[PDB]
Structure 1
Amino acid sequence: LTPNQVNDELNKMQAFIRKEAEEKAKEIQLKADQEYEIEKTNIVRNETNNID
């Protein structure tokens, strides 16, 4: 009814959506670093097998 409750609810909903978006956003690079390290280790072993 009042605009203060809708402004506080939208202000909390926007900050919660932004914090959930960033906190859900960090895991992509957080897993992508270990995936890139695993791919680099697999390529390094794949080259080291033929090198040996």
Structure 2
Amino acid sequence: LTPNQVNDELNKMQAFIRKEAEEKAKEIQLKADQEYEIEKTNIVRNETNNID
């Protein structure tokens, strides 16, 4: 009902949304790095067999 409580709740909601977006971006980056590392390792072994 107060005017400052809407700005404080909007700032806390924006900070929570920014923290959730940063956590989702960090988890997506970690999963993409793990999948790229697994695919690079599989391709590296798949070339290393015929090279050997």
- The Cα shift of 1:23 comes to 1.1
- The Cα shift of 1:14 comes to 0.5
- Equivalent pairs: percent with the same residue? 100
**In 1, Cα distance between the equivalents of 2:17 and 2:29?**
19
State TM-score, norm by structure 2. 0.86
Give the count of matched residue pairs.
52
Over the residues paired in the alignment, what is the CA RMSD in angstroms? Answer: 1.0
State TM-score, norm by structure 1. 0.86
- The Cα shift of 1:26 comes to 0.2
- The Cα shift of 1:37 comes to 1.0
**In 1, Cα distance between the equivalents of 2:46 and 2:3?**
64
**In 1, Cα distance between the equivalents of 2:25 and 2:37?**
20
Q: For structure 1, which runs of at least 5 residues remain unmatched after alignment?
A: none
- The Cα shift of 1:5 comes to 1.0
- The Cα shift of 1:36 comes to 1.1
